[PDB]
Symmetry: none
Subunit: 287 residues, 2 copies
């Protein structure tokens, strides 16, 4: 169905994280770190590791199973407008049917040719920052991009969950890499030579370091998108307003831009609980 093959990237990430939990706790902390009796380190890593581990898997879970938000029923063509639009043959006259409907909706953007943004498949008038996804077969409010590593679209409901998933990916990889670093050296100078545990300790430092540098660019890109209040699509095709194209049409200042996604309640900023302001169908404009 193509759905099944879509669950392959998440199974890979699941096994790599499951392997990292067994490798970091069993092979590294119990066999290696506890094997040389260094006072006060085995416990302080296990409590900190579990703390990073739960935040990583909880944010990753939310990004996967948080269904993407769709436009409300107000943006769908009524039976009167959907009929006349389907039967109208002149492209000029069918545009007026969409334009009159757009006056009753909070729509401030148009196509590149000054055309009312309309989705022929869903038979609805696309709201601002909303785009149709051929994988999800639905319009996604404030669609950022379809992330294949979570088998879901990153939209208005997912965005803050996706960003935290990146951040906790960085800290989980940074913590593992920085803590395994001191013991990755000892197996090479041959202070330790455990045949049963050497192989697991090495990959931890390489897999965590190769994933750290990978998502780090992905994390820096979105820190710059959020400050500018742009989605991944808007960075490549800026939305067109009445006064022309403007890639900063939705910007409200770097401080207020972040709060549009994270909210004003500070107790939900770092937790993967929906705290994004607004409804996803309409967004404050700069002008």
């Amino acid at each position: 169905c193509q759905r099944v093959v879509g669950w392959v990237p998440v199974l890979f990430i699941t096994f790599v994280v499951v392997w990292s939990y067994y490798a970091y706790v069993v092979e590294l902390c119990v066999f290696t770190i506890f094997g040389n009796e260094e006072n006060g380190k085995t416990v302080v890593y296990l409590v900190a590791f579990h703390l990073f581990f739960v935040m990583f898997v909880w944010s990753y879970w939310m990004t996967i199973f948080t269904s993407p938000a769709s436009p409300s029923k107000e943006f769908y063509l009524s039976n009167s407008e959907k009929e006349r639009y389907e039967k109208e043959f002149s492209q000029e006259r069918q545009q007026e049917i969409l334009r009159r409907a757009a006056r009753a909706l909070p729509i401030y953007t148009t196509s590149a040719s000054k055309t009312i943004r309309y989705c022929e498949k869903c038979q609805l008038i696309k709201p601002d920052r909303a785009h149709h996804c051929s994988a999800c077969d639905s319009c996604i409010l404030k669609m950022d991009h379809h992330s294949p590593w979570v088998n879901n679209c990153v939209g208005f409901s997912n965005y803050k969950f996706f960003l935290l998933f990146l951040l906790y990916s960085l800290l989980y990889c940074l913590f593992v890499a920085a803590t395994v670093l001191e013991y990755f050296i000892k197996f090479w100078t041959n202070e330790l030579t455990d045949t049963r545990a050497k192989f697991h300790v090495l990959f931890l430092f390489f897999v965590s370091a190769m994933f750290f540098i990978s998502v780090l660019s992905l994390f820096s890109y979105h820190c710059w998108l959020v400050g500018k209040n742009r989605t991944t699509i808007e960075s490549f095709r800026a939305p067109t307003f009445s006064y022309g194209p403007d890639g900063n049409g939705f910007s409200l200042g770097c401080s207020k831009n972040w709060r549009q996604v994270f909210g004003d309640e500070k107790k939900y900023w770092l937790l993967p609980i929906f705290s994004s302001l607004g409804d996803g169908c309409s967004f404050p404009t700069r002008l």
Copy 2:
């Protein structure tokens, strides 16, 4: 104030500087002297050390040039004089203040407008943007034939830097390709324990990975600009085709594949692979297809 912000822009170049200085120490001292030369192969050592230095000097020369070549800014002809800028600041009508820019544009070689048929004007610099020129908020200036603000060089890629930036990507691939190709033979052996220099293990293995990660990364970045040069498009223009008097046209500056490359590298073949300024034009006006 800005001591924290302006200095943090130099962090990406100091990171690459340390990676390169280390790669020089890792390839010459640890690999060629300690690893390769300890293995009774003085023929491969000297041929590598000179081949490495040839790529190393071309790599750092292009890198330095893309950094310290300041981007081109508009000339005083495009600035609004104190007479024209006075009447514009006082005007409140949108079309009447636009008429001010229209008569001024009849004296400038400008063939592009905005997507909404408006004269490209810059409120911060108080000038009329030349063609292909754009304003950079990081540089706080207008940049002639601006491509993109590449943070890894802490500078704008514009009309004067572009060839240096392109050669900096070319020599990065070759510097990484040469290292990846040469360290490959000795990378496999250390995993089969075929050699054991406790001190050489750390540098030789990191050499292969660091050079392999950078190669595959900049390979896409290098491939994107080779298309831009052939189409005579900047990065900004690949996102939004410019609009001329006859409408939007992504190939409005295209003069053919061969003639577009010479626009950046020049007609003198001796300057093609050298990071010395050889780009055609003045940056304020460019030949159009029509």
